[PDB]
Amino acid sequence: VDVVMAPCSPVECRTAVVIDVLRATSTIVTALSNGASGVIPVKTIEEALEKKKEGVLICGERNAQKPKGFNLGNSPLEYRKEKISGKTIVLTTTNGTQVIEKIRSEEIIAASFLNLSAVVEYLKSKEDILLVCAGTNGRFSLEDFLLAGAIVKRLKRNDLGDGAHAAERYFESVENTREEIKKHSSHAKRLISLGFENDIEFCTTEDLFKTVPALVNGVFILKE
Amino acid sequence: VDVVMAPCSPVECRTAVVIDVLRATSTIVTALSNGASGVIPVKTIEEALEKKKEGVLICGERNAQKPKGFNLGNSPLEYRKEKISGKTIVLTTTNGTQVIEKIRSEEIIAASFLNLSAVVEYLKSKEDILLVCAGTNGRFSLEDFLLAGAIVKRLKRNDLGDGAHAAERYFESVENTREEIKKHSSHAKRLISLGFENDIEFCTTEDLFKTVPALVNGVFILK
Numbered sequence: 001v002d003v004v005m006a007p008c009s010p011v012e013c014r015t016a017v018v019i020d021v022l023r024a025t026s027t028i029v030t031a032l033s034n035g036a037s038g039v040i041p042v043k044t045i046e047e048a049l050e051k052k053k054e055g056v057l058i059c060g061e062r063n064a065q066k067p068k069g070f071n072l073g074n075s076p077l078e079y080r081k082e083k084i085s086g087k088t089i090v091l092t093t094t095n096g097t098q099v100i101e102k103i104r105s106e107e108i109i110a111a112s113f114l115n116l117s118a119v120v121e122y123l124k125s126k127e128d129i130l131l132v133c134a135g136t137n138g139r140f141s142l143e144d145f146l147l148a149g150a151i152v153k154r155l156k157r158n159d160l161g162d163g164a165h166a167a168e169r170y171f172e173s174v175e176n177t178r179e180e181i182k183k184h185s186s187h188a189k190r191l192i193s194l195g196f197e198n199d200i201e202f203c204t205t206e207d208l209f210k211t212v213p214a215l216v217n218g219v220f221i222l223k224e
Numbered sequence: 225v226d227v228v229m230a231p232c233s234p235v236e237c238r239t240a241v242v243i244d245v246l247r248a249t250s251t252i253v254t255a256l257s258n259g260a261s262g263v264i265p266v267k268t269i270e271e272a273l274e275k276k277k278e279g280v281l282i283c284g285e286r287n288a289q290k291p292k293g294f295n296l297g298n299s300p301l302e303y304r305k306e307k308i309s310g311k312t313i314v315l316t317t318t319n320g321t322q323v324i325e326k327i328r329s330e331e332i333i334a335a336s337f338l339n340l341s342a343v344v345e346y347l348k349s350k351e352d353i354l355l356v357c358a359g360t361n362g363r364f365s366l367e368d369f370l371l372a373g374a375i376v377k378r379l380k381r382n383d384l385g386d387g388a389h390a391a392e393r394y395f396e397s398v399e400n401t402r403e404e405i406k407k408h409s410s411h412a413k414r415l416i417s418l419g420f421e422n423d424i425e426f427c428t429t430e431d432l433f434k435t436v437p438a439l440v441n442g443v444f445i446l447k
Contacts, residue, residue: 002363002364003364004363005364006232007232008230008231008232009362136386138228138231138235139226139228139235139387140227140228140385140386140387140390141386142386142389142390145386145390160408161363161410162360162363162365162366162409162410163363163364165366166364166366166390166394169393169394169398170393170394170397172397173393173394173396173397174393184389185386186386
């Protein structure tokens with residue numbers, strides 16, 4: 001098991017876990033956990049808007065804010081059952097598909113603090129696992145790294161790559177995940193500065209959900 | 225101050241610190257500290273060979289070993305004063321130029337455990353700082369992250385980006401630098417398997433030198 005932060009070239013493993021805590025994977029998990037039919041990650045706003053149709057919502061962000069003409073932004077709190085149940089979500093975030101496209105594997109699942117325990121349980125039986133942290137605009141993402149460390153610690157493996165080892169050690173130094181992220185994540189700060197502090201609290205809520213999204217044919221859906 | 229591990233796109237900052245402990249920056253620091261006139265990073269083996277001439281040594285590695293036709297490999301221990309003093313070093317490593325090219329900074333220095341305090345003192349009067357860890361074939365490099373954390377700790381700064389904070393916290397978890405690396409660094413373990421244990425001990429030795437190599441328009445020199 002190993003951890004990579006904002007990989008540049010294709011990464012290859014049997015089971016890949018994409019992590020983008022401050023919102024992308026938190027949004028994906030939330031949307032599916034609240035009834036959405038699927039979440040389609042898309043690179044550009046053009047491609048996003050191009051897929052508009054009934055029962056399909058154009059969602060995402062640019063500068064962390066909902067683009068013009070979009071139905072929803074990238075705040076997990078917007079994805080309530082009453083608004084997305086049985087609907088398909090097209091999701092575009094800054095470099096969202098970019099991290100996903102550099103993954104060569106037999107399966108790609110989405111992990112967040114929201115479904116931490118469920119992801120851990122799904123991975124316990126898996127061999128050759130790569131936790132892929134999206135990072136932020138090419139920079140290190142503390143919250144992604146923190147979740148990776150929490151996952152690694154709970155897998156109780158001794159076969160750990162450099163990234164997994166550092167993430168686990170880092171995780172062991174944390175007394176309060178939520179506070180750690182509020183005080184040291186530059187992206188958390190940006191989100192708070194734009195008025196999304198509630199998202200930080202929601203996204204750092206552990207096991208609110210018990211689902212495990214998997215990318216199947218370009219679409220994140222729920223697996224048994 | 226922040227830390228980035230194997231950056232994909234050009235990263236900007238007034239002052240940058242390149243870190244490739246298990247060898248490249250340790251090699252650069254050792255070479256210049258022992259007399260080399262400068263160290264020129266080169267991308268391909270072909271390019272390197274074309275720079276051959278009097279006063280110049282072709283050095284580097286591929287799969288951690290010295291390629292055919294090369295004068296020195298990438299073991300800092302080969303860079304003895306009475307072997308490279310006054311000579312220009314042409315250095316090509318698997319991803320050397322790859323990482324350097326991503327650093328959009330006018331001030332770029334090389335750091336290793338070998339010149340740790342010297343690097344810290346140099347950075348004491350620097351506004352913006354980005355510690356750039358080279359990584360290992362695109363993967364996380366534990367030894368680089370550890371040096372980055374050690375540096376952040378000594379800078380005594382409060383303005384830390386995500387990478388710097390995570391590196392400092394990681395550094396705080398380490399009881400013994402050398403043992404941490406020998407046991408958990410995949411590249412360190414690889415080098416040990418290849419017969420370079422001496423490099424692991426040397427490169428993790430703190431402050432053998434007081435120099436601070438700086439990349440000045442394509443060449444690492446001592447200003």
